[PDB]
């Protein structure tokens, strides 16, 4: 709904309070201009991971 009403330009800023930050969709607002940060507990770089 944000991307429909056009509120993801440069200037805005967003914080997701979850654990699966990339577990949701992010290709929508990736190229926007806004800046999005969050949190992960599952780091894909590790060996057993």
Q: Tell me which residues touch its own copies (CB under 8 A).
A: 3-6, 8-9, 28, 31-33
CB 12 to its own copies: min, Å: 10
In the bound state with its own copies, the residue whose beta carbon lies nearer, of 25 and 45, is 25
CA distance 28 to 39: 18
Cβ 14 to its own copies shortest distance, Å: 14
The length of the chain is: 49
Residues whose CB is less than 8 angstroms from the CB of residue 9 and which lie 6 or more positions away in sequence, other chains included: 32, 33, 34
Tell the smallest beta-carbon distance from residue 3 to its own copies (Å).
8
């Amino acid at each position: 709904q944000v991307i429909t009403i056009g509120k993801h330009v440069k200037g805005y800023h967003y914080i997701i309070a979850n654990l699966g930050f990339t577990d949701g969709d992010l290709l929508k607002i990736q190229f926007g201009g806004a800046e999005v940060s969050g949190f992960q507990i599952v780091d894909y770089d590790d060996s057993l991971v």
